[PDB]
Amino acid sequence: VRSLNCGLRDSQQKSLVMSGPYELKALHLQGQDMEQQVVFSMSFVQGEESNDKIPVALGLKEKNLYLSCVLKDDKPTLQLESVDPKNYPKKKMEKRFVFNKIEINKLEFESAQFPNWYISTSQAENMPVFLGGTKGGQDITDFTMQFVSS
């Protein structure tokens, strides 16, 4: 299974960063808070490889943590789940972990497990990243892949 390493930044220039051990937040870096964005390991998994759609899995480089979509309090919710390093990424994986990466010049990440739910950020700084179902309103659903390198 082919993987890559990148950071993600919404369309408003908010970089994804770590909150505590089990949550992400978004805030404008560069000249405010310096350059360290979470490094994701994006794997090319199996599913419908539509037109501009590629099924991927988003993992926290070196944490053995994956983003997953689960129902909590009856709403599709983003959680970071533990996985066994022996078994992951590898595979063609479970649904809760698959996101359809939709290309536009920006990217959207739709929950494969919950069609029409997207990885979203608020307009406000330092807020948690979440699964949102509007794609219009004040929450951001568009991102760019950032180089980290080394």
UniProtKB/Swiss-Prot annotation:
Gene Ontology CC terms, in alphabetical order? cytosol; extracellular region; extracellular space; lysosome; secretory granule
Q: What keywords were assigned to this record?
A: Cytokine, Cytoplasm, Inflammatory response, Lysosome, Mitogen, Pyrogen, Secreted
Query: How changing residue 72 to E affects the protein?
Result: Suppression of integrin binding. Markedly reduced activity. Markedly reduced activity
Which residues are marked as site: Important for interaction with integrin?
53, 61, 63, 72, 86
Tell me how the protein is altered or processed after translation: Activation of the IL1B precursor involves a CASP1-catalyzed proteolytic cleavage. Processing and secretion are temporarily associated.
Segments carrying motif Involved in interaction with TMED10 C-terminus: 109-122
Tell me the compartments it is located in: Cytoplasm, Cytosol; Secreted; Lysosome; Secreted, Extracellular exosome
What tissues express this gene product?
Expressed in activated monocytes/macrophages (at protein level).
Q: Where is the major localization of this protein?
A: cytoplasm
The processes (GO biological process) annotated in the record are: apoptotic process; astrocyte activation; cell-cell signaling; cellular response to interleukin-17; cellular response to lipopolysaccharide; cellular response to mechanical stimulus; cellular response to xenobiotic stimulus; cytokine-mediated signaling pathway
This entry's comment on induction and repression of expression is: By LPS. Transcription and translation induced by M.tuberculosis and a number of different M.tuberculosis components in macrophages; EsxA is the most potent activator tested (at protein level). In pancreatic islets, release is increased by high glucose treatment. In pancreatic islets and macrophages, release is also increased by endocannabinoid anandamide/AEA.
According to UniProt, where does the site described as Involved in receptor binding lie?
Answer: 2
Give any GO molecular function from the UniProt entry: cytokine activity
What does the record's miscellaneous section state?
Answer: The IL1B production occurs in 2 steps, each being controlled by different stimuli. First, inflammatory signals, such as LPS, stimulate the synthesis and promote the accumulation of cytosolic stores of pro-IL1B (priming). Then additional signals are required for inflammasome assembly, leading to CASP1 activation, pro-IL1B processing and eventually secretion of the active cytokine. IL1B processing and secretion are temporarily associated.
Q: Its family?
A: Belongs to the IL-1 family.
Q: What is this protein called?
A: Interleukin-1 beta
